[PDB]
Design a binder for this molecule. Structure first.
Ligand SMILES: CS(=O)(=O)NCC#Cc1ccc(S(=O)(=O)NCCC(F)(F)F)cc1
Ligand SMILES: CS(=O)(=O)NCC#Cc1ccc(S(=O)(=O)NCCC(F)(F)F)cc1
Lengths: 187, 187
């Protein structure tokens, strides 16, 4: 309500500048509320970012669950694309959220909890592919899954932030899908 | 001299706690010098970390140049192993150096300059492998190289920091080499 206005303001301001350069007064002003009214909904601007990141992570997780409840190259591409579109639609929050992992235990723990879930699901799909005889028994599935998820984390976030170096955003899906399919199916 | 003692002290203290929890007075005391004598060799504790990271990055780069001036799976493993051993021998500096990328333009630019070099060298070796007919012309070599280097950055540093999630350090070389060889040679 006022909560949503605060969150919408924070997402808008993060498009232009870092959390460090955004005051509680900036978020209050943008949301049309006082400073003490702000503090009724959120203990800090840090908790605003935690809630924004929580919503974006849950949106991606819910989109991947929808896919899971329904060719091998297209199967992986469709799944990687959940993360590309979801985080790529929320670049300001992605970026600020990754930077807050260093300073926020709640942000580090949110990101860690979802990465463990996404890795466990990746490993379960590789195992299914091995069980049906489509993928060879090479590396431990859980270790392969970990490295691939870490690759995607670093490569997606570098591309969205326009880091040097980065894969251009228009090439990153093809790039990741190639490495996933060759490393999962390759003998 | 006193410079080396300051650097050795900083590396020792970073084994126990973050830069934020290390004072110029801590580095001076450890190096057996006064606070103003410290400031003669370094403008700040941040510049000490920049110099430590500079030395570790150059050690890895010089080891990779030595290799370059001399089976396909073993060739990539030997090269990845430069980074595994070099950064893995300097875990405190690696960790503090990666955290300083967020706050230090000099640290962000050092890391970016060497990543561009290492990616350009990776791409040149893939191209050579394609030219000799050992590797298929799949992805653009420079884009494949970028994602693989980013994977290694994230996966090595997660393992060395014992992050959750991470590939166990005793499995990370096998894990990365498998993804490199299948993605470089796989059709
Ligand atoms: C259509 S399907 O059945 O759902 N395909 C199977 C799948 C899947 C799957 C895809 C991508 C990733 S990840 O590595 O991209 N996510 C980590 C967060 C990051 F994006 F930060 F990496 C993880 C799992
Ligand atoms: C024996 S040889 O001829 O030298 N083999 C060819 C090679 C190579 C080569 C290996 C590993 C990497 S990287 O991706 O590990 N480094 C990025 C820094 C990071 F470690 F942070 F990633 C880059 C290039």
């Amino acid at each position: 309500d006022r909560e949503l206005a605060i969150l919408a303001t924070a997402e808008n301001l993060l498009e232009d500048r870092p959390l460090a350069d955004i005051s509680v007064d900036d978020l209050a002003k943008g949301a049309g509320i006082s400073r003490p009214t702000f503090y009724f909904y959120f203990p800090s601007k840090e908790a605003v970012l935690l809630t924004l990141l929580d919503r974006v992570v849950n949106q991606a997780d819910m989109a991947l669950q929808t896919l899971a409840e329904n060719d091998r190259e297209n199967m992986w591409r469709t799944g990687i694309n959940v993360f590309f579109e979801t985080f790529g639609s929320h670049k300001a929050v992605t970026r600020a959220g990754q930077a807050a992992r260093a300073t926020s235990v709640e942000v580090a723990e949110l990101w860690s909890t979802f990465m463990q879930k996404w890795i466990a699901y990746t490993a379960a799909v590789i195992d299914a592919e091995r069980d049906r005889g489509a993928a060879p028994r090479t590396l431990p599935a859980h270790e392969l899954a970990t490295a691939l998820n870490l690759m995607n984390e670093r490569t997606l976030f570098a591309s969205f932030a326009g880091e040097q170096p980065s894969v251009p955003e228009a090439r990153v899906l093809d790039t990741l899908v190639h490495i996933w399919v060759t490393s999962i199916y390759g003998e």
